[PDB]
Scaffold this active site. Structure first.
Site, PDB file in Angstrom:
ATOM      1  CB  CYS A 137      -0.860  -0.216   1.216  1.00  0.00           C
ATOM      2  SG  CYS A 137       0.199   0.049   2.782  1.00  0.00           S
TER       3      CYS A 137
HETATM    4 CL   LIG Z   1      -1.127   2.393   3.513  1.00  0.00          CL
END
Ligand SMILES: [Cl-]
Ligand SMILES: Cc1cc2nc3c(=O)[nH]c(=O)nc-3n(C[C@H](O)[C@H](O)[C@H](O)COP(=O)(O)OP(=O)(O)OC[C@H]3O[C@@H](n4cnc5c(N)ncnc54)[C@H](O)[C@@H]3O)c2cc1C
Ligand SMILES: Cc1cc2nc3c(=O)[nH]c(=O)nc-3n(C[C@H](O)[C@H](O)[C@H](O)COP(=O)(O)OP(=O)(O)OC[C@H]3O[C@@H](n4cnc5c(N)ncnc54)[C@H](O)[C@@H]3O)c2cc1C
Ligand SMILES: CC(C)(COP(=O)(O)OP(=O)(O)OC[C@H]1O[C@@H](n2cnc3c(N)ncnc32)[C@H](O)[C@@H]1OP(=O)(O)O)[C@@H](O)C(=O)NCCC(=O)NCCS
Ligand SMILES: CC(C)(COP(=O)(O)OP(=O)(O)OC[C@H]1O[C@@H](n2cnc3c(N)ncnc32)[C@H](O)[C@@H]1OP(=O)(O)O)[C@@H](O)C(=O)NCCC(=O)NCCS
Ligand SMILES: [Cl-]
Lengths: 565, 565
Positions: free
Chosen positions: B531
């Protein structure tokens, strides 16, 4: 698969819920919250009042639907647990929408109910202009009185952090305010002479501060007469929702538009007393270091529980957010059998007071006098960074320690810059078990915008260790008004400095002329020395003791004396 | 009396001289300084060039006359020690003014002579437009060329603390600047992927930064033509003191009005080599931990002396002012027979780079690989205080540690706010011997203007302890471009973010839809997860590992990866 039930959905319980999901995909997790919101920013609420947090939306960090999608936790808002039946392993919950009840079973339970503001037995307190602040609906009620009663004067009672942040928020909005505290000081984690820095900043901003004062009675008078422009009266300073008339402990009267009661919080223990779980002598839930309560299937953490004091090991109440988030994550651990122990609480805290910050960790001087722990104390007043680079600010710093072993008891700080960094360093140093003498060898960050070759903390060490080693001999602010016929008082500042304040009866010999002018002082007296902050005092003390004089140096100098009165 | 002579009247020497007087009034103390000034602020010099520090008198902290009055030390300015006769306990001293020389006897001697800038073997480097920066008169020469040569473009060579400060100072004057560094990074105390945050912030200000490059030749050309208004010429962009043409190692030419040489400093060892004193393999004076040289009557401290590296116990060179001031204090103690031992150097450092600060303590990854120490690292990108209160900034923070024992090797941090405080905490934590597992229990200051419920430091600790305990499995920024047929790339950001950059070939499932979408990922491959920062990736990791997949998380997320290229 373990069925986990969590009571409360804020700092303690939300933090256990997300942790417990990362630990196991098979467990059933259900979290109850009696309010409308979970994972809200309690600490943000006075800042949204003043507009400093412009966006109501910013106070909400997680939602029921976000907890579902990310962590699969079923969160039920407007659901209040009203009983725990321990033998059955069932809890009764009430649905606030319609007052119906149902039961839910648990394999293990976490109590995380927090602590409710203190109700004081004051006649007439309960009225439409008087509020305490714990959650978002309390904040909206405060907001709505400010608007609707056109508040122009307001009174806050209690000088702890919530009181000082309401006071400051109200002042941000243009409101004239009065703060009452029964104590002789605001903020009790810091000692009285350190609070004086705060008292003067508060009075510098036009705030009516009244210490040593209690609120005796509250009289609420409904407004009967609505003035109006069609009657050709002045409607600008009108208050349509009424007036408060307060009686103080000394018979004086205070007229006001809004009263805020911030006199502290008490643990939420009713569900736990009703289920027969142990309560400690402070009135908090009793837990072991694994966070388990008298019933091994039931955990508790946060504001509601009593903790172990890091310095002394005794029970204490410390309702702060840091400890409550890390306790809830550790309870989730233990609920899956990790057997993790929580390591005690230092009470590290900090509060904003207009341009100042006031900070502390460990034990203050009142708590040590009261527990009969012997101690000694030092002050310095040292630039937050190199003084030759712009924006440096005086950091007034106190260090409490054992005069023999060098054990660190506590630290306090006050000033306009770098206080959050000094208290973090001392919190780390104490938790890791360092003594004063070791504090001397700290290698901290230095470039001119950020620090100095010897830090505030290095200078405090050297002053503390010099006393421990017998290279210094102290006399504190509280002893110096009371001199005997064998003591001669000596101001070693320059003569221009004397018009700022001094002490009745001092002879003046500036430190830079002392070596030469020495024979002026008789060797049959104990020479009692002071300067502005204690540093030139130390130089003078070494020259005297090095030539066979008996001597003492006032620690903190005149600056500590003057803020202590 | 004890007769004490000090060579050097700056950070090491001065601190010894004031301390030595507080210890004894009967000692004789004489301090020689070859230049005009004693106790000057070395560190403030680039800031007075920019006008930041407005007053040339703020750089001078003591004088010869102030040291006579306050401490009865005889300081001799423009006296240079040119020889030491150890056998005789005599030094030979040259009077600058005259060239006349005398002898002076001593019971004990302190060398604190500092470190001189490095001379590169570059053709034509010695000219009127080129300067390095050690002292006040170096600084005056720089200001004088800037003015007289109407400097509009300048070149700085070296990307360590002085280079980066001179570059900032010149930009602050509206001068166009070029920084040349041979290394692939500025600020070698932090690894290359942390310095990338600094690379961008310097190019963001329009500085022409050339890494991996060297300066091969310097050609100085006098100006023959003085353009005049009477001659009807533009006089605005003239440089009457001449012009520099530089040849670089890639063969490119660079035209410039001023050259600053900041490629490092080397210990002053000539007096010590001439006297027979021991010198280490790094070329610094060799001392024991009581600050004594190979002659027991001779002490040495500061920039001239090799130190003991805290972490590893080997020799290192670390020319910083904190250490120098504390060592000179300790040397004074030892000269009065206190036998105190220094305790090693961590290399705690911080530098301002435009709105960023870049800081570090301990060892970096470079120094660990080179010394063959097995380590692991974590990254976090955490808000400097509660991000619901304005002004909060990303703190990018790296932690280096022993993946099985939890020993703390080093910490590094870069960002707009709160970098001084994170580095001081880690320097405290490592000097006290705390492990990564113990850092998880740090109880720091939290009030929304300052900190957060879990600090940057709690977060880093949790991420690293998870690795140590086998609750996390890391891939780093330098492994993720590989991948086999046994590995499958998964991006768990929201679709909207892929917009700002990604990794080719990734399959996108956002974490808040992953629990439901997960059958899409085949179990016979190890799922490699990323991410933005690594926080959502952790949550995805726990979901897959908890359902029997093999998985890794990209530690530092795309952010750390992006700034590594
Ligand atoms: Cl993140
Ligand atoms: C204005 C203000 C400012 C603050 N500032 C700071 C600060 O700067 N720094 C700091 O460290 N701390 C600060 N705090 C304190 C911090 O908010 C708390 O210490 C921390 O929130 C405690 O977490 P908790 O889970 O124990 O309780 P809470 O946050 O109070 O959460 C408990 C939840 O349980 C719910 N509940 C209770 N009983 C039941 C029931 N029977 N059934 C269902 N739900 C129930 C409540 O409605 C509540 O929402 C501040 C507090 C206030 C009020
Ligand atoms: C531009 C600049 C910025 C810096 N910024 C920082 C910073 O932000 N943080 C930090 O920690 N450090 C910084 N430093 C470094 C710090 O200044 C040094 O680490 C420290 O001054 C070293 O102290 P010292 O006593 O060893 O040497 P010095 O301070 O160099 O003093 C030595 C003295 O010895 C004298 N001398 C040498 N030989 C003789 C002799 N034979 N006889 C008589 N006198 C002699 C010299 O002329 C000199 O004045 C900076 C340095 C510079 C130059
Ligand atoms: C937010 C809250 C829901 C906790 O959720 P959370 O997912 O546990 O919290 P965080 O955002 O802090 O994430 C922490 C987790 O991320 C991991 N982590 C943090 N940064 C990381 C990164 N850069 N890369 C990888 N992992 C990271 C941590 O290791 C940790 O996981 P772990 O406990 O399994 O080790 C809870 O704290 C809360 O509701 N707080 C607001 C209410 C409150 O505290 N109010 C008090 C008054 S201000
Ligand atoms: C200033 C300098 C001359 C040293 O003088 P100094 O008197 O030792 O330095 P300080 O002002 O920091 O004072 C420290 C002393 O005061 C004492 N002290 C500090 N605050 C005190 C207080 N408020 N009350 C009582 N004592 C105090 C300390 O214990 C210490 O005495 P000690 O060593 O005997 O324990 C030397 O540091 C110097 O020349 N600095 C500038 C040069 C320099 O360092 N530049 C390099 C990089 S910028
Ligand atoms: Cl003083």
């Amino acid at each position: 698969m373990k069925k986990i039930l969590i009571i409360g959905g804020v700092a303690g319980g939300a933090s256990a819920a997300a942790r417990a999901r990362r630990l196991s995909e098979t467990a059933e997790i259900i979290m109850f919250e009696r309010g409308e919101y979970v994972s809200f920013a309690n600490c943000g609420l006075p800042y949204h009042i003043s507009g400093e947090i412009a966006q109501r939306s910013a106070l909400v960090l997680q939602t029921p639907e976000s907890f579902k999608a990310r962590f699969n936790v079923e969160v039920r808002v407007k659901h209040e647990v009203v009983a725990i039946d321990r033998a059955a392993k069932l809890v009764t919950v009430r649905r606030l929408l319609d007052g119906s009840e149902y039961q839910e079973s648990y394999d293990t339970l976490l109590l995380s109910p927090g602590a409710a503001p203190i109700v004081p037995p004051i006649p007439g307190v309960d009225n439409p202009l008087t509020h305490s602040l714990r959650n978002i609906p309390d904040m909206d009620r405060i907001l709505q009185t400010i608007q609707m009663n056109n508040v122009e004067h307001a009174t806050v009672v209690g000088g702890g952090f919530i009181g000082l942040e309401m006071m400051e928020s109200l002042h941000h909005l243009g409101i004239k305010t009065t703060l009452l505290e029964l104590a002789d000081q605001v903020m009790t984690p810091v000692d009285r002479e350190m609070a004086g820095f705060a008292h003067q900043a508060i009075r510098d901003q036009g705030v009516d501060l009244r210490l040593g004062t209690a609120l005796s009675e509250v009289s609420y008078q409904v407004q009967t007469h609505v003035a109006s422009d069609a009657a050709g009266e002045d409607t600008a300073h009108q208050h349509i929702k009424g007036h408060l008339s307060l009686t103080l402990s000394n018979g004086e009267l205070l007229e006001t538009d809004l009263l805020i009661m911030a006199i502290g919080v008490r643990p939420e223990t009713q569900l736990a007393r009703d289920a027969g779980l142990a309560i400690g002598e402070l009135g908090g839930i009793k837990v072991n270091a694994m966070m388990q309560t008298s019933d091994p299937a039931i955990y508790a953490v946060g504001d509601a529980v009593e903790e172990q004091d890091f310095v002394t090991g005794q029970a204490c109440l410390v309702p702060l957010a840091g400890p409550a988030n890390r306790q809830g994550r550790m309870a989730a651990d233990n609920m899956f059998g990790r057997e993790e122990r929580y390591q005690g609480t230092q009470g590290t805290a900090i509060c904003k007071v207009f341009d100042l910050a006031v900070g502390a960790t460990g034990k203050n001087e009142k708590q040590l006098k009261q527990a009969g722990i012997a101690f000694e104390k030092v002050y310095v007043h040292t630039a937050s960074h190199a003084s030759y680079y712009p924006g440096a600010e005086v950091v007034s710093f106190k260090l409490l320690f054992d005069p023999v072993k060098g054990t660190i008891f506590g630290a306090q700080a006050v000033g306009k810059d770098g206080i959050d960094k000094r208290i973090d360093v001392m919190a780390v140093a104490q938790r890791a078990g360092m003594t004063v003498e070791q504090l001397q060898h700290l290698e901290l960050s230095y470039a001119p915008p950020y620090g100095s070759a010897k830090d505030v903390i290095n200078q405090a060490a050297f002053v503390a260790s010099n006393i421990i080693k017998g290279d210094a001999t102290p006399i504190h602010f509280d002893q110096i008004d009371n001199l005997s016929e064998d003591q001669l008082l000596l101001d070693v500042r320059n003569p221009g400095e004397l018009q700022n304040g001094g002490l009745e009866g001092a002879v003046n010999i500036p430190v830079d002329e002392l070596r030469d002018r020495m024979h002026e002082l008789p060797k049959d007296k104990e020479i009692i020395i002071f300067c502005q902050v204690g540093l030139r005092g130390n130089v003078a003390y070494r020259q005297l003791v090095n030539n066979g004089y008996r001597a003492r140096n006032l620690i903190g100098g005149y600056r500590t004396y003057k803020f202590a009165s």
